[PDB]
Every structure is written in structure tokens, then in C-alpha cells.
Design a protein around this ligand. Sequence first.
Ligand SMILES: *[C@@H]1O[C@H](CO)[C@@H](O[C@@H]2O[C@H](CO)[C@@H](O[C@@H]3O[C@H](CO)[C@@H](O)[C@H](O)[C@@H]3O)[C@H](O)[C@H]2NC(C)=O)[C@H](O)[C@H]1NC(C)=O
Ligand SMILES: *[C@@H]1O[C@H](CO)[C@@H](O)[C@H](O)[C@H]1NC(C)=O
Lengths: 80, 45
Amino acid sequence: TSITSDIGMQFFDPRTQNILFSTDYETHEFHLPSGVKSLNVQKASTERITSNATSDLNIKVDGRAIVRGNEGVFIMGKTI
Amino acid sequence: DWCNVSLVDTSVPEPGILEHDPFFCPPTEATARDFLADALVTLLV
Ligand SMILES: *[C@@H]1O[C@H](CO)[C@@H](O[C@@H]2O[C@H](CO)[C@@H](O[C@@H]3O[C@H](CO)[C@@H](O)[C@H](O)[C@@H]3O)[C@H](O)[C@H]2NC(C)=O)[C@H](O)[C@H]1NC(C)=O
Ligand SMILES: *[C@@H]1O[C@H](CO)[C@@H](O)[C@H](O)[C@H]1NC(C)=O
């Protein structure tokens, strides 16, 4: 169901006259939708990664892991 | 610090429909007719 133009897709509910969805990204800022399972973003600025109180975080990667601490790293744990 | 002492009091800060009308689109109203009785007359003469 392809579409094509210079600007792109649009949609706004006429009962609000607010653009509920657009694809001229420079104008309207994108927001995170609800109900998302995973997201694969090519660059992340994360303050903290944490799990929930049941299962284990797994920083797993087929590639190489390069963790660099500019002021230093501190590993705290029971069995390391 | 007495220089950054801030005082605040009360103030008086006080700052959906959808419809479109086209012109017309009526269908075939009164959909009934026949071409036999007149044919019978003009073939019975
Ligand atoms: C805390 O994190 C754990 C780890 O992810 C959560 O457990 C996992 O939760 C997911 C989604 O609720 C489960 O996925 C689904 O589970 C059902 C049955 O449990 C299964 O039929 C589906 O196909 C799908 O896999 C996952 O199984 C579950 N895993 C375990 C080991 O419990 C947990 O829900 C999180 N709790 C909170 C409060 O966030
Ligand atoms: C209030 O504190 C700020 C931050 O230290 C300072 O720059 C400012 O000069 C202070 N204001 C006064 C009136 O001293």
C-alpha cells in the first residue's frame, strides 16, 4: 500500500485539529508509542540500565563489548 | 543567606466536532417501470 511524495504521510483527527501523526520529522517531534516490546535504535543516551526484581540483565552481544570508564570503573558484587 | 530570600503570595493566573457537507449524490429514486403494455398496444394496432 505504497505512498510517495516530497513531504509524506499525514493524519489529524478533525475533532481536534491536532496532527495525530505526521512524517515531516523536522517539524513535529516523534514520541515513543505505547505497547512496544523492543526497539532497535542506532544510538542511545542512557543514564541507567536496570532489570526488574525477578530476572537477570544480560548484556549479550555477538560483537565485542568495549566498556570504557573515563573517570574509572567500580565492580561491586558477591561472586565476580 | 538573606540575599536570596524569596516571598510568594497568591495571585490571579487565569489563561471538538467533525462535519463536512457535499452538494449532492442521489441514486435512482423510484425504481420501477415496464415496457409491455405500451408494446402490446403498438403491436396490437
Ligand atoms: C520481571 O521480569 C521477568 C523477566 O522478563 C518477567 O517474566 C517474564 O514476563 C514475560 C512477560 O510477562 C513472560 O512472557 C510471556 O509469558 C507467558 C507465560 O508466562 C508465555 O506464555 C508467553 O509466551 C510469554 O513468553 C515470560 O514468560 C516471563 N518469564 C519468566 C521466567 O517469568 C516478569 O513478568 C517481570 N515482572 C514484572 C512485574 O515486571
Ligand atoms: C542567589 O544564589 C545564586 C547562586 O549561588 C547567586 O548567583 C545569586 O547571586 C544569589 N542572589 C543574591 C541576591 O545573592
